[PDB]
Design a protein around this ligand. Sequence first.
Ligand code: F
Ligand code: F
Ligand code: F
Ligand code: NA
Lengths: 125, 97
Amino acid sequence: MIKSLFAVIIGGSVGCTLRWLLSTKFNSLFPNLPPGTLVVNLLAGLIIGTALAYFLRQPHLDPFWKLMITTGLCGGLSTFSTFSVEVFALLQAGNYIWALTSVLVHVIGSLIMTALGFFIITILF
Amino acid sequence: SVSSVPTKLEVVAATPTSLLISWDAPAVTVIFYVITYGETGGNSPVQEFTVPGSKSTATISGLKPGVDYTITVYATYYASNSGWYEYGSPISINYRT
Ligand SMILES: [F-]
Ligand SMILES: [F-]
Ligand SMILES: [F-]
Ligand code: NA
């Protein structure tokens, strides 16, 4: 399904490039909880929540666009492997308090953002 | 604004034969420090060990009395800006036992 492949690639490429820019320009600012990595995960939550809710209201929207936004954009923008390494590293550095804070702020942060994205569109309809 | 080099490396206690060094950790997340030492001439090989990134001191043992040593510390750290670990640039000192 080459039409779908193009959606994952174009969307993912946009997502990954965004992650890259935000991560390189901002992660040094606070290395116990890199702001760039946090922000991409937060933002991809916001985006995906609003998109999911939006697609429930637009049930004729081509799966191409839905694929581009979720599996591509958000999936390329957000990152688990980067998050895990950051945390792993803080474990390696014995910095347990920020290792813990980092998983709380990433998981709880992203749930709040996905919910806010989904519900600010649900309250809007 | 990014600190990956230790600062203020110094011998804080010493025998003729052993050394207690401390440095100030950099900002970044250090997984381990690398400690290197050897006689400042070049006359004997160079010794090297690591210390966990949680520690900002180390001891050095079995040195020869009255010899100038060169001591070097660098961080192996996670460069959050690039997504891999990096061996940081070192800070170095001379010390005569
Ligand atoms: F997320
Ligand atoms: F992962
Ligand atoms: F993280
Ligand atoms: Na990803």
